Amino acid sequence: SMGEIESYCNKELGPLPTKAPTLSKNVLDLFSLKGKVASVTGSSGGIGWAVAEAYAQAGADVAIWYNSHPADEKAEHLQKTYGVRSKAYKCNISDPKSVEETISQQEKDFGTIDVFVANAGVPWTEGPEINVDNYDSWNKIINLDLNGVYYCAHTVGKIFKKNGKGSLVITSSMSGTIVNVPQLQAAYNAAKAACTHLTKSLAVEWAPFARVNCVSPGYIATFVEKDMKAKWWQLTPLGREGLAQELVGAYLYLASNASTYTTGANLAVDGGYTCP
Amino acid sequence: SMGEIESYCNKELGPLPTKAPTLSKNVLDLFSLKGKVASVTGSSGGIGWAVAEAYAQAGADVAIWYNSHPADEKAEHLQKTYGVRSKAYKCNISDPKSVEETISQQEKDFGTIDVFVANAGVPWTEGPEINVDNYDSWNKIINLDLNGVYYCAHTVGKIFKKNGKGSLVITSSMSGTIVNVPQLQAAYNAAKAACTHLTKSLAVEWAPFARVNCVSPGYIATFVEKDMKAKWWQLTPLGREGLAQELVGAYLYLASNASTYTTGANLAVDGGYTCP
Amino acid sequence: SMGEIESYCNKELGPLPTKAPTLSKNVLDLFSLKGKVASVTGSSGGIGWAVAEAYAQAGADVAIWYNSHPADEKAEHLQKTYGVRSKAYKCNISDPKSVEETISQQEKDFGTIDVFVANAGVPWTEGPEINVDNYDSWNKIINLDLNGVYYCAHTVGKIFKKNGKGSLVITSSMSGTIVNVPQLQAAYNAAKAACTHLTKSLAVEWAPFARVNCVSPGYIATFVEKDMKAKWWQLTPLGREGLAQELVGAYLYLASNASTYTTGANLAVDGGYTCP
Amino acid sequence: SMGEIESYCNKELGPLPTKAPTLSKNVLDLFSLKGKVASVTGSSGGIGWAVAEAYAQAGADVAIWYNSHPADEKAEHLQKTYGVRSKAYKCNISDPKSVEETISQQEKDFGTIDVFVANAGVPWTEGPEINVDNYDSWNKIINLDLNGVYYCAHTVGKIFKKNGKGSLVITSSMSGTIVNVPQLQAAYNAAKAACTHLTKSLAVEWAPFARVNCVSPGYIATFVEKDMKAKWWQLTPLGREGLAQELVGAYLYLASNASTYTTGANLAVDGGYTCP
Ligand SMILES: NC(=O)c1ccc[n+]([C@@H]2O[C@H](COP(=O)([O-])OP(=O)(O)OC[C@H]3O[C@@H](n4cnc5c(N)ncnc54)[C@H](OP(=O)(O)O)[C@@H]3O)[C@@H](O)[C@H]2O)c1
Numbered sequence A, B, C, D: 001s002m003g004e005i006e007s008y009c010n011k012e013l014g015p016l017p018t019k020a021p022t023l024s025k026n027v028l029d030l031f032s033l034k035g036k037v038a039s040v041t042g043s044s045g046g047i048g049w050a051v052a053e054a055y056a057q058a059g060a061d062v063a064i065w066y067n068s069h070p071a072d073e074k075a076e077h078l079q080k081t082y083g084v085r086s087k088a089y090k091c092n093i094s095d096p097k098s099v100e101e102t103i104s105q106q107e108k109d110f111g112t113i114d115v116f117v118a119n120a121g122v123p124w125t126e127g128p129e130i131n132v133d134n135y136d137s138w139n140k141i142i143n144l145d146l147n148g149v150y151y152c153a154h155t156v157g158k159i160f161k162k163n164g165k166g167s168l169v170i171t172s173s174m175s176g177t178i179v180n181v182p183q184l185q186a187a188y189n190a191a192k193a194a195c196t197h198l199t200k201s202l203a204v205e206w207a208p209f210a211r212v213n214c215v216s217p218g219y220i221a222t223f224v225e226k227d228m229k230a231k232w233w234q235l236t237p238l239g240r241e242g243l244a245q246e247l248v249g250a251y252l253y254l255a256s257n258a259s260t261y262t263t264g265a266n267l268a269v270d271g272g273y274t275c276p
């Protein structure tokens, strides 16, 4: 121990200070994902598909994930439009054995994983908990939106550690920071808050070999009660819901060398909703 | 709804504004729990027993909970010493059925429940998650420290709604706000962050009939290695661990009429640890 | 240095760990202010007067502060109703020389100061900054609501350090955490956020001799546009404004031995407003 | 207002919902600043010069600011190297009159301003405030690091409102979120916390015509003692200080169309320092 400065955060960092990464002098090259492999869960859905296509535009090979809506045409669209390698995988992410099998298969098909986006999730749709007289809905949310996120993280983290590099982005939500009204959804709020702090916890644990960040989107447009959204608009400083395309910059920032000193951060993309 | 301002948070509040409570003119009377019934989970342990005895000193009947360390003599101690009603209940709080049965039995035994402290919990002891090859410890933490807290909350909330009054205090942790070092414990951190935000979520949902708050203790003297504790002291602005007696003021403040406009709040009692 | 554990926060703490305070075993005695001297600025106003009277009920001598509304009858009311020593002082807290003169006079009249509440402040009333084409209103807010708070803190802190004990409570606001709507008040929001973080900063700096905490009230009732408050009520989970009497428990908690491990904390008393 | 949903945040948004922007289908095009004019205060210094050159690489004209270190050759360097328009301006930003004159001159010289970075600032260097017998250093920090930021914001905001578009990025600091140790600097911490919340406040007020965000850097290599730096490294999860080139991605993300739904956000770029 003598003759070394040892970290208080994680002694696996080795003698301090650690070495800064080599970076391009041109800011635009920092955002490139050329030569990197990305794996995006929930990429048959709106947000995940937008991020997957953005990563392919940035040069990444993209592993697509789906559960009930096969996304093979999406992977083949990435294939043919951007000349990257892409393939879709079927997985129920609430099953930890299935998550491990899928990620191990992706590592074999692509060689490695450089960027992972833990994005799949489901909403709570049943209103006030106090009237829901069993726990299956609570457990469904926790099992996919928290446990499933962790199954993905734990599994891909072992790949990142083997290679000494990697970027994990978790899709949280403004629901992890505030309480949505008037549609009440305590179970989802709690799971996303756990996601946001799991991000910070894993950033510390994985610092020798990877960065971990999350994005917390606000309301993103996609046959929901018009007066309820009217109240959302009224409480949103920008005055509107967001588009999936307004999220891809944040996910590319965190995935790429643009953010090599950014870890444990939560990037709010919510139209200002968390400010009032 | 014409002629009535109705809430954007919870229309069960009825026509706004709601009526302010009647409060004693004397500040010390606000902290009294005379004529109220308290239920404190994990009150065979250090923090929970300190809070239970404090509530008894404030005049409350106290339902004591244990799992593996029977606390009947503690109940007994409270009845004898302070003249309040008290009885100890055995319950594995990770079992939702047992939680329901125990709280219903307490309602029968004491008549009602006015104050509930969801305090039982277990730590993560196994170091960095990346070396842990199964999910049993993760699941153990989530099932008691998050799901079990929610089983307690959902069950007692129906009592609060029926009676139109109640105060729920959840024991979170500074681990819900920061990432402990050097002992890495992502699963516990995630569960406690979920607890802190479940507090806020339920505060909104239960507003017509109850208040919901949490206390986030720092390191409390309640058997670990000497160098690790030393780094805790170095990072704590007050320079020491806390005593359980330094928590009871916060729990009495939130449980009593001293805090009738306080809901959804997280009260840090951590020696300043969350500040650096 | 050898043979001592030295703090990373503040080496003036001395060899770690520091000694825990001696505390009563009865929770209610922890809240007493008997034998202690309190100084409450802005105590001719609503919140400050409620806190002053609560501190006197708890047994404290109370120094009253006023600027444009003489409060001598208030001090004499404390005198005669509770048998404590009390006296009112005139001071424009935006004047740093006047603050130092007033606190030094109070130390002479009362012997010492044990509890200080930096509570005086003024609101921003002029709507959107972009239309206010000079800076006198901005500077008026910063000078009293931030600089004046610091003048008080810096001055009483020297007394706390001399005596080795003390508790500073700063009146912040939920405006230091969120952005009020629809009445826009950026200058006030910025000053109160600075207040909340000054609390945390001074908690670290003063840890060898004092604790520093703040209270962040929500809307407190006291001939303001009825539809504007209607929107406040709609966005407040409890559905109403608060009473000054609902704040005094928080100020007594932080002032007294009930909170001896609580420092750098922000206690939200806002009806849940910061949760949505 | 019958027939129109109007905002609870800012009725200048007009009838809700507001219209989404037109965005490129290609993620890399979102980060371009071609055809835009940027103004970066403190761009003779380390961070500001890095951001200015990054903006020029993205295609923006860049107005450079200096105070005591003339940066005309830097402007010159940008024009020469990247073919954009650039010129350096001398201004003491603590003087509100000079700030107004400088920004009006830039509007004349460049035609408009599309992006503003309020980055100039000075540190607190004098250790614990309790030993500092006057307020000159406190006032110096507040006047530049808070008031001067606001003078810049108020002035350029009127340009943004006139043109109906703009992006303001404020350089805050992790010191607005946590308390630096062991070098104690309450005045700087308070000013930066005010900056972070001024960001959110102005995001709400300017929503009809501009976005407002801030970046909170950690320790950036930009001459201090070796033991103190060593403790910084020990408390930083990544194990090192950051480079200014590791910040430019965040500033380009916020300045460009990559972030059109991002407003009121604080982007931490601190090596994880705010996590433990
Ligand atoms: N306003 C918003 O939409 C919003 C805001 C904040 C955060 N988020 C979060 O953004 C993420 C993406 O959601 P979205 O908005 O794009 O909604 P979405 O279109 O419904 O996407 C949901 C995705 O999750 C997958 N999924 C659902 N259950 C799964 C399971 N058991 N196992 C594996 N995958 C499963 C779905 O796959 P299949 O369709 O193939 O079954 C789908 O790809 C979620 O984490 C969401 O909570 C959304």
Ligand SMILES: NC(=O)c1ccc[n+]([C@@H]2O[C@H](COP(=O)([O-])OP(=O)(O)OC[C@H]3O[C@@H](n4cnc5c(N)ncnc54)[C@H](OP(=O)(O)O)[C@@H]3O)[C@@H](O)[C@H]2O)c1
Pocket: B041, B042, B043, B044, B045, B046, B047, B048, B065, B066, B067, B068, B069, B070, B091, B092, B093, B094, B119, B120, B121, B122, B123, B144, B171, B172, B173, B174, B216, B217, B218, B219, B220, B221, B222
């Ligand atoms: N530094 C700290 O101590 C600290 C800091 C922050 C937060 N907390 C939290 O404080 C709470 C625990 O208090 P503590 O520190 O005093 O620890 P403790 O002395 O070990 O007590 C833990 C309590 O939880 C009970 N418990 C454990 N498993 C249970 C289960 N399945 N079902 C029902 N009850 C169970 C235990 O009962 P039995 O003993 O009878 O089995 C015991 O009463 C937890 O929420 C903890 O995370 C502690």
Ligand SMILES: NC(=O)c1ccc[n+]([C@@H]2O[C@H](COP(=O)([O-])OP(=O)(O)OC[C@H]3O[C@@H](n4cnc5c(N)ncnc54)[C@H](OP(=O)(O)O)[C@@H]3O)[C@@H](O)[C@H]2O)c1
Pocket: C041, C042, C043, C044, C045, C046, C047, C048, C065, C066, C067, C068, C069, C070, C091, C092, C093, C094, C119, C120, C121, C122, C123, C144, C171, C172, C173, C174, C216, C217, C218, C219, C220, C221
């Ligand atoms: N909804 C709320 O009311 C609310 C919410 C959150 C936080 N707060 C904060 O609570 C604190 C007390 O405010 P309040 O609600 O009780 O309003 P208030 O009744 O108007 O009290 C204002 C106090 O500040 C004093 N004051 C004003 N200017 C002063 C100056 N230059 N120098 C010294 N003292 C001065 C006033 O003294 P004189 O009257 O004698 O001139 C008065 O005692 C303030 O910090 C406020 O920002 C209020």
Ligand SMILES: NC(=O)c1ccc[n+]([C@@H]2O[C@H](COP(=O)([O-])OP(=O)(O)OC[C@H]3O[C@@H](n4cnc5c(N)ncnc54)[C@H](OP(=O)(O)O)[C@@H]3O)[C@@H](O)[C@H]2O)c1
Pocket: D041, D042, D043, D044, D045, D046, D047, D048, D065, D066, D067, D068, D069, D070, D091, D092, D093, D094, D119, D120, D121, D122, D123, D144, D171, D172, D173, D174, D216, D217, D218, D219, D220, D221, D222
């Ligand atoms: N570790 C860090 O470096 C760190 C971390 C977080 C935040 N920040 C913030 O980054 C910004 C400064 O960048 P830096 O770190 O690169 O420090 P820096 O190299 O010393 O540059 C500071 C800039 O501020 C200018 N400046 C100083 N006083 C001024 C005044 N009265 N009027 C106008 N401009 C003035 C300076 O101009 P002249 O040199 O020409 O006088 C210089 O350009 C500040 O907001 C700082 O608080 C820095």
